[PDB]
Write a protein that binds this ligand. Structure first.
Ligand SMILES: COc1cc(N2CCC(N3CCN(C)CC3)CC2)ccc1Nc1ncc(Cl)c(Nc2ccccc2S(=O)(=O)C(C)C)n1
Length: 286
């Protein structure tokens, strides 16, 4: 059913892994349609999205569709799909296991504290953002629009240095993520790649505040009105001007005025080269 990079594909095109080759190990949390587990294949370590046996037809198709989409990507900042197990119940989608967990947790559990005073530096944050901008770039030059670029949808391979960040859910592509959306998206329902640009800008704020909820204190409707009136979040605490400057460029009201990801990428690179930026200390939370 699904078309990408030119090629058209279908369920026949997914790697069916024999169920007997799949061991579940522990649960990791819950995604859209159910608990995700840590698991194995034969020795291969994976995450296992599962579909609850008692679910709707549309549930069946959303689940299959997530597999097709994520299976056609080939980029190192987009989580890999090992295969599926769709011919035994409950259904499985096997994905690259990201030991560092999701980005919003990582940021929160790694905030520098008086004991972990050097858990992270500004340069770790810029690499996480480089990683994701690189993924979003790959999507843009393939005309794919993600629609939900947010910290909760990103993942890290490992906790320590050497960690690579990747876009790890494609569920979108009052439940609406208003706080990540540009005016023309929540008003006119128009999406283009300039809307992932806006979202990325908000992700950048999440990254540099260390996992805070955007527009702290505002409900969905207040954000919608704030944002359409020209309102914009302040710099996260300690955020360097040049990094904030990328945020406010991503949030330009006119889609045509926002940068594309090649340009965002250049500017994260320049930030990364600037001693004034990366010699900046993160807030040690007490
Ligand atoms: C060891 O591997 C993981 C650990 C965690 N966590 C979650 C937070 C938890 N802390 C414990 C302490 N608490 C105080 C706070 C919570 C630490 C470990 C989260 C994710 C992973 N790995 C992983 N890889 C690929 C996918 Cl594909 C996926 N997907 C996945 C895993 C879990 C839930 C949802 C999805 S998802 O695919 O639907 C998407 C939303 C990322 N998760």
């Amino acid at each position: 059913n699904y078309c990408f990079a030119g090629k058209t594909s279908s369920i026949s095109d997914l790697k069916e892994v024999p169920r007997k080759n799949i061991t579940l190990i522990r649960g990791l949390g819950h995604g859209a349609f159910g608990e995700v587990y840590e698991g194995q294949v034969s020795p291969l370590q994976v995450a296992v999205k599962t579909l609850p046996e008692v679910c709707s037809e549309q549930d069946e198709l959303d689940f299959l569709m997530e597999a097709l989409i994520i299976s056609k990507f080939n980029h190192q900042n987009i989580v890999r799909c090992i295969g599926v197990s769709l011919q035994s119940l409950p259904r499985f989608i096997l994905l690259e296991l990201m030991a560092g967990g999701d980005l919003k947790s990582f940021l929160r559990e790694t905030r520098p504290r008086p004991s972990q005073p050097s858990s992270l530096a500004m340069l770790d944050l810029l690499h996480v953002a480089r990683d994701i901008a690189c993924g979003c770039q790959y999507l843009e030059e393939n005309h794919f629009i993600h629609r939900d670029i947010a910290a909760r949808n990103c993942l890290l391979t490992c906790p320590g240095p050497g960690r690579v960040a990747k876009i790890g859910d494609f569920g979108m592509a009052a439940m609406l993520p208003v706080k990540w959306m540009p005016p023309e998206a929540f008003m006119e329902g128009i999406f283009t790649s300039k809307t992932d640009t806006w979202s990325f800008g908000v992700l950048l704020w999440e990254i540099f505040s260390l996992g805070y909820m955007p527009y702290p204190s505002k409900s969905n409707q207040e954000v919608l009105e704030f944002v359409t009136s020209g309102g914009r979040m302040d710099p996260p605490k300690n955020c360097p001007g040049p990094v904030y400057r990328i945020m406010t460029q991503c949030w330009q009201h006119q889609p045509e005025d926002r940068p594309n990801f090649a340009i965002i990428l250049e500017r994260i690179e320049y930030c990364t080269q600037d001693p004034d930026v990366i010699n900046t200390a993160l807030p040690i939370e007490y």
